[PDB]
Amino acid sequence: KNKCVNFNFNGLKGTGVLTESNKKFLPFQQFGRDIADTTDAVRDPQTL
Amino acid sequence: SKFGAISSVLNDIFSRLDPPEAEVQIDRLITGRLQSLQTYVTQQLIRAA
Amino acid sequence: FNATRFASVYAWNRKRISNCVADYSVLYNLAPFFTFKCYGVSPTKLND
Numbered sequence A: 001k002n003k004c005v006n007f008n009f010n011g012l013k014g015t016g017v018l019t020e021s022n023k024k025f026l027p028f029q030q031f032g033r034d035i036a037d038t039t040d041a042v043r044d045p046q047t048l
Numbered sequence B: 001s002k003f004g005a006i007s008s009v010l011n012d013i014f015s016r017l018d019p020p021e022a023e024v025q026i027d028r029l030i031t032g033r034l035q036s037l038q039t040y041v042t043q044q045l046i047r048a049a
Numbered sequence C: 001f002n003a004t005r006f007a008s009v010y011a012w013n014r015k016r017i018s019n020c021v022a023d024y025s026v027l028y029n030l031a032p033f034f035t036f037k038c039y040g041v042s043p044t045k046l047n048d
């Protein structure tokens, strides 16, 4: 966390910095997309 | 926009497909995005006039 | 794959696979599987 790292979250490959998100995900949501289909946020498949 | 490609995200194309036929989809996406950027710059030049 | 019973191409059998860890090397490593054609995905990447 808080360090530029290559991440593969459940098959989603990418490069970026991971930070504790402060946006209220509803319990049935599993991804967050910004404009133009870019994955803004993702939930850890292990600790959720 | 998928520009006719399987997916609009490059990472999925590279992960799902091996280089041989993956390059075909990457070429399509790159051509589409180059065309869009060229159109953007052409419009910018026209408006700059 | 190894079931003795295979249905006709009509009323074709359908099995849903859920909540498991797959390993596709057990499939394409088999000698009889002469034909292995994939659309939208490649044989080498299935395990990733």
Ligand SMILES: *[C@@H]1O[C@H](CO)[C@@H](O)[C@H](O)[C@H]1NC(C)=O
Residues within 6 Å of the ligand: A045, A046, A047
């Ligand atoms: C996954 O396993 C870890 C380690 O045992 C555990 O801390 C975590 O709660 C588990 N999560 C789920 C969704 O089972």
